[PDB]
Design a protein around this ligand. Structure first.
Ligand SMILES: CC(=O)N[C@@H]1[C@@H](O)[C@H](O[C@@H]2O[C@H](CO[C@]3(C(=O)O)C[C@H](O)[C@@H](NC(C)=O)[C@H]([C@H](O)[C@H](O)CO)O3)[C@H](O)[C@H](O)[C@H]2O)[C@@H](CO)O[C@H]1O
Ligand SMILES: CC(=O)N[C@H]1[C@H]([C@H](O)[C@H](O)CO)O[C@@](OC[C@H]2O[C@@H](O)[C@H](O)[C@@H](O)[C@H]2O)(C(=O)O)C[C@@H]1O
Ligand SMILES: CC(=O)N[C@H]1[C@H]([C@H](O)[C@H](O)CO)O[C@@](OC[C@H]2O[C@@H](O)[C@H](O)[C@@H](O)[C@H]2O)(C(=O)O)C[C@@H]1O
Ligand SMILES: *[C@@H]1O[C@H](CO)[C@@H](O[C@@H]2O[C@H](CO)[C@@H](O)[C@H](O)[C@H]2NC(C)=O)[C@H](O)[C@H]1NC(C)=O
Ligand SMILES: *[C@@H]1O[C@H](CO)[C@@H](O[C@@H]2O[C@H](CO)[C@@H](O)[C@H](O)[C@H]2NC(C)=O)[C@H](O)[C@H]1NC(C)=O
Ligand SMILES: *[C@@H]1O[C@H](CO)[C@@H](O)[C@H](O)[C@H]1NC(C)=O
Ligand SMILES: *[C@@H]1O[C@H](CO)[C@@H](O)[C@H](O)[C@H]1NC(C)=O
Ligand SMILES: [Ca+2]
Ligand SMILES: [Ca+2]
Lengths: 172, 311, 172, 312, 172, 313
């Protein structure tokens, strides 16, 4: 897709993640774990909720009947009404198809961009202490316990604390 | 031996297909319908002062056909017309009929005002017919009067009747022209003289000549506040005893569906009611009220989630 | 937003920047300075001007009266005209709302993309002589005077001149 | 320790709210209105060969009512009709009135051609009335003639009048039918005989009979094609045409109460005045004429002309 | 443009590449070469094929005649028909212009995104063994023969094999 | 020096200009047309049970003009009308003509039913004229009968004729009224007496009087007779009475065009100039089309981009 993350450099989604749309899976000495990102999840959900508020509604225009159900209409006027109604139906059918096709394209790409923005946020956080593996993961070049993993997820990871250790492990 | 942190997104086992600009078969995590395909086979009349006319046709309310005796006056926000509703007991039709029906179906009520029209002793104003039965006896349109000669064969006298609109709103006045079956019948009821009915006001003028099986054709116009409408006639006029005032605004519905006072609806059609919150609808192009727009589509799924990329 | 710069990793806009849409602020030994980027500003302005040219216009179709202002009309044909006008008005009201909502979404994201394209251009210029702080700035690891800052803004910065000095400062 | 270069974007103190596909309350640096909500209460007629009819009704131009003496002939690209405009000085009305009024308001001018109708010695063709005052005393519809008997009480003779369309374009012919108030009046003007005004042509055919019952003259009309003849057979009651009309070209019909303004130009008009905007949409009225912005049910629709405003 | 590659940091297109939309051009001791990328080319083509399948169609609604070609119609109803047909034609003309303008914008930016996603894929393969030159090329800091270049194009380049050669060349 | 690998895109020498949201002059590698500007100058009638009337006018099928002798009866899904088509051989015109023509062009066939009217020895029902020529000699409208007196100068008798609709669908009945040129011509055919025709059903009632004023003319009238209803013609000279009535069968596509028939090719969209067989969504030939058509737009061209920005060397 447009931003290259969802159905892109991330190979597939996680069925195990049920408490969020985007999140993290880590690996260290203590073991493995999983956690959802609240901010990126709500950013996507609030944007979809906005679309629904705008699309799921009708006009308040009161329309009356111009065609009798139980008696014959004038033949001339009836043909004009039939031409007009079928023309109006073709416009609305076209507009409905275009609306939903356009919105679905935007919804998919919007969600893709939120995945990329979370990924880019973590990259700049880690700075020179990690390297990209190309699959949406960061190989971290220092000892990174559960509290250190939490600080990456919580956006309080200080790169300068581990920089000296990490640069030596990267150069090797 | 580096540690790892992996970014990722959710997925589901059972995804749903939607259409995009570039792909007909795009799988997403969730979606929702935008086209309503189901209708309630009922007229949802909750919160509506409604009138079910039943066997009464809207035009029958103004002239007073026996079927419309219980609908000669009233108020409403919704007026329901049924199939095979009776407007005319005697043979005939109204000029600009559909225009008149639509005007009644837009109203929010009808009230009646007396014309007070009087006729001399030479005129029998209480003419009746077997075609219009009321209480097991020969009758006539309740808001009109069949004027004929008291003595058979005699000339119907030159008569003048004027109605003034004293109200602050416009009134709807109706009348009929009897077109006799034969020359014998014409001479029996209205005499040998040549017949001519003139109707005139500030905003209206017309002349009618009875064509000589039998039929009473109806005509109508509006009398504005303060204006006078005059009838000049010498036989053939079916004169009004009362005129109508259409009050306010209301929603007209044509349907055979039964009424239900439990559910609410702002959109109606022949088949019933459409209560949906969805923007589009595929039941019928003929709808009334505040409706979702009609589309030639079974379904249009709106995506409410990302691409589903399962494990 | 889609490209993650405006209302994203760049914390806020600059009210003090009055001569451009996008630009540079720097800090060195000498002091501080500010300057607008012309190329990115005009790219954003030209695209918006293009939208206004297409949107701010009317059709050349000549329409005549079908409803008399001072005299009556037949009630049936008046209802047909009213139904048709209300149907056409519902379409144009819907089209106007969709147009502006779609264009506003695109304008905001287009402007976001021009900010990111400028950011990416500067990242690639500096190469291995700087690092990203995550807030839209680049920490440059050599003495970078006003002339050197000007060369970054004017796209004439040569990374080779400062590479040996910069790499030594980065490794420490 | 290290030097810095920072990338950023501009902002403003007072931002403006716009709607996006995804957000109702999106603040941007600048926006511009797409729906016009203000109108000039004046008809902007600059660069237009226009005719303000004033008190004259369009049909009055064809028949020649006193109020329409200044508008019997001319050319125009725009014709302006006003409220309570006078068509008929004498009581009466035209059959198929609205269709005629529309046809006149679509045209771009009018010219008059003489019928050349001559009458016998027993017909007085110069009948006038106090209802149609012109200059000082009594007069009549300029383009028509009230035909009555010269001697009071005598029978109006069986007359035949024929008009030939000698022009390449079609002509519009009008005539009236007098409907006397009483049988005494009927006898004084046309005599005791039974009346029958018959009109006939290749296209048109109709018969009229004066009903008896400060009187009335109802008008009728039809189109005479090029080359074709139209015949009038009558014995009293006919109000015959001295001239016929030819509608020249095409023009824009406006119905409005707003005063004229020859300084400003415009292409869109409504009852209240002119709509001069370059904006695509408009919420003043659904009844407009000319080249107009499209009517919408919206007070405002702000189009963003700038980025997201992220202040402070 | 939106993603900054086509008509952006990539200075121009290659008229010599006639076997694909996107591709590679290398330079090593053995010489120079050119090769198209099949995956990114088809991703762009398949999306444009999808647009054509949706756009290039008409409705199945049967419209009958309401205006006579050879005879006159009633004047009042003819005016209503003329107003209605001109209103419907203004709608469809507006819809057709908006459709094509919107789709062209998306097609152009979609093609730009596919270029960037190929560029970003190559960047992450090479990892720490190369650096970006700002013109869409990667300067590789090790001997990379035609088999090495083929492994970059075919997505089988293992960075860890060339890492030790590259880090020495980059740091001096 | 380091080895290089460069990413890049294709391009062309001659690009094509398209419109986007932000640029009227945007060059792309290729584009394709969305508005059709060309038409085939033929009526493509393959897979259609069609009827080209040719010189016959639709109204002439109901009354039976000599030009319409092969179009009195039939079934069809498509009906083609031509310019300057002959409806009337004798001078005259139908009242409410356009509404009748439209109703016929919507139909999918016509069938005829006999009225069964028989006239006495006084009446001559085989009235003919040189205007309506058939098979070399003089003739009259095939579905009508010009009724005159057998003895010239004699009074036409007070005749009564009643058609009864025995079908379950409505029938279209047409009649004429002769308006004589002179009083001498009127007296020779219908006598000295005052003429008066009455037409009456349950949903129709009208009187018709001939008017005296080198041929005459016959003006036609029409109405619909409902199932189980009857229509009575009372008259004493002047009536051109129906020998047969019409029944409009089903529905069909009415086309008005000057283009010739072609049975080798198919189409679902037609106009005055011919057929439109394009796959494109829009079209700018004419706003007046029939069938399943592309939508009319006020545009010469609308190019849809099928490729990236063209950035040439
Ligand atoms: C109309 C129809 O469908 N069929 C005709 C039969 O109705 C008709 O049969 C005769 O009908 C006579 C009707 O008598 C009244 C009536 O309608 O009740 C008697 C009323 O007092 C009289 N009212 C007034 C105000 O004049 C009324 C009126 O004259 C006529 O309706 C005007 O047309 O007539 C009666 O019952 C006879 O006994 C009955 O045979 C037959 C025979 O004429 O013809 C059908 O076409
Ligand atoms: C052509 C003609 O006869 N003109 C008369 C005119 C007509 O006879 C009349 O309008 C036909 O309806 O009448 C005029 O006098 C009107 C008449 O009105 C009475 O109420 C009043 O009592 C009389 O004194 C007289 O004014 C007219 O001007 O309309 C005279 C005209 O010559
Ligand atoms: C039914 C009938 O009477 N048919 C006549 C026909 C009609 O009488 C006539 O068309 C009614 O208008 O007239 C036919 O002759 C035409 C007639 O034309 C005169 O101008 C001329 O003076 C005559 O000699 C004669 O030609 C006709 O063919 O129309 C004869 C037909 O039998
Ligand atoms: C206008 O369109 C309606 C709907 O297509 C037509 O109504 C149908 O008429 C056919 C007769 O050919 C019936 O078989 C259908 O049952 C009708 N459908 C409905 C929903 O009523 C109508 O005939 C058209 N009117 C005109 C004047 O052409
Ligand atoms: C067509 O719509 C117009 C405008 O809504 C209607 O005119 C209004 O009628 C109501 C009466 O219910 C009045 O209160 C308003 O003052 C009228 N407004 C204007 C601007 O004229 C009109 O009645 C409708 N036509 C028909 C036939 O129903
Ligand atoms: C409708 O439009 C056509 C084509 O422009 C025009 O010739 C015709 O006069 C119009 N119809 C009416 C009734 O004005
Ligand atoms: C644009 O160019 C391509 C080149 O292969 C060709 O298919 C056609 O001319 C255009 N594309 C489409 C999809 O029509
Ligand atoms: Ca209404
Ligand atoms: Ca017109």
């Amino acid at each position: 897709g447009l931003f290259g993350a969802i159905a892109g450099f991330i190979e597939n989604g996680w069925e195990g993640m049920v408490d969020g749309w985007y999140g993290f899976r880590h690996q260290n000495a203590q073991g493995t774990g999983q956690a959802a990102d609240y901010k990126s999840t709500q950013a996507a959900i609030d944007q979809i909720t906005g679309k629904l508020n705008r699309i799921i509604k009708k006009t308040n225009t009161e329309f009356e009947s111009i065609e009798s159900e139980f008696s014959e209409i004038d033949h001339q006027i009836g043909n004009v009404i039939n031409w007009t109604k079928d023309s109006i139906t073709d416009i609305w059918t076209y507009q409905a198809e275009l609306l939903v096709a356009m919105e679905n394209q935007h919804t998919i790409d919007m969600a893709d961009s939120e995945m990329l923005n979370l990924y880019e946020r973590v990259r700049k956080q880690l700075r020179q202490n990690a390297e990209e593996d190309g699959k949406g993961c960061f190989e971290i070049y220092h000892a990174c316990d559960d509290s250190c993993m939490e600080s990456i997820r919580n956006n309080t990871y200080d790169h300068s604390q581990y920089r000296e250790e990490a640069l030596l492990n990267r150069l090797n | 031996d580096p540690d790892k942190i992996c970014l990722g997104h959710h997925a589901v086992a059972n995804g749903t297909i939607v259409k995009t600009l570039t792909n007909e078969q795009e799988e997403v995590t969730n979606a929702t319908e935008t086209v309503e395909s189901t209708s309630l086979n009922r007229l949802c009349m909750k919160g509506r002062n409604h009138k079910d006319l039943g066997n009464c046709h809207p035009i029958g309310m103004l002239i007073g056909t026996p079927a419309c005796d219980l609908h000669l006056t009233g108020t409403w926000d919704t007026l329901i017309e049924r199939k095979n509703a009776i407007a005319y007991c005697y043979p005939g039709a109204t000029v600009n009929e559909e225009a008149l029906r639509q005007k009644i179906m837009e109203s929010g009520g009808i009230s009646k005002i007396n014309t007070g029209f009087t006729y001399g002793s030479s005129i029998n104003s209480a003419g009746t017919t077997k075609a219009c039965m009321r209480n097991g006896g020969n009758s006539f349109y309740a808001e009109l009067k069949w004027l004929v000669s008291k003595n058979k064969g005699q000339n119907f006298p030159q008569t003048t009747n004027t109605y003034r609109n004293a109200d602050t709103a416009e009134h709807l006045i109706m009348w009929g022209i009897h077109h006799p079956s034969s020359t014998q019948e014409k001479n029996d009821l209205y005499g040998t003289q040549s017949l001519s009915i003139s109707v005139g006001s500030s905003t209206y003028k017309n002349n009618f000549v009875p064509v000589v099986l039998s039929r009473i054709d109806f005509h109508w116009t509006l009398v504005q506040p303060g204006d006078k409408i005059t009838f000049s006639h010498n036989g053939g006029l079916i004169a009004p005893s009362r005129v109508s005032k259409l009050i306010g605004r209301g929603l007209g519905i044509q349907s055979e569906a039964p009424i239900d006072n439990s559910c609410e609806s702002k959109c109606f059609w022949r088949g019933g009611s459409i209560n949906t919150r969805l923007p589009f609808q595929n039941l019928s192009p003929r709808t009334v009220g505040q409706c979702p727009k009609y589309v030639n589509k079974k379904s249009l799924m709106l995506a409410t989630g990302m691409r589903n990329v399962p494990e």
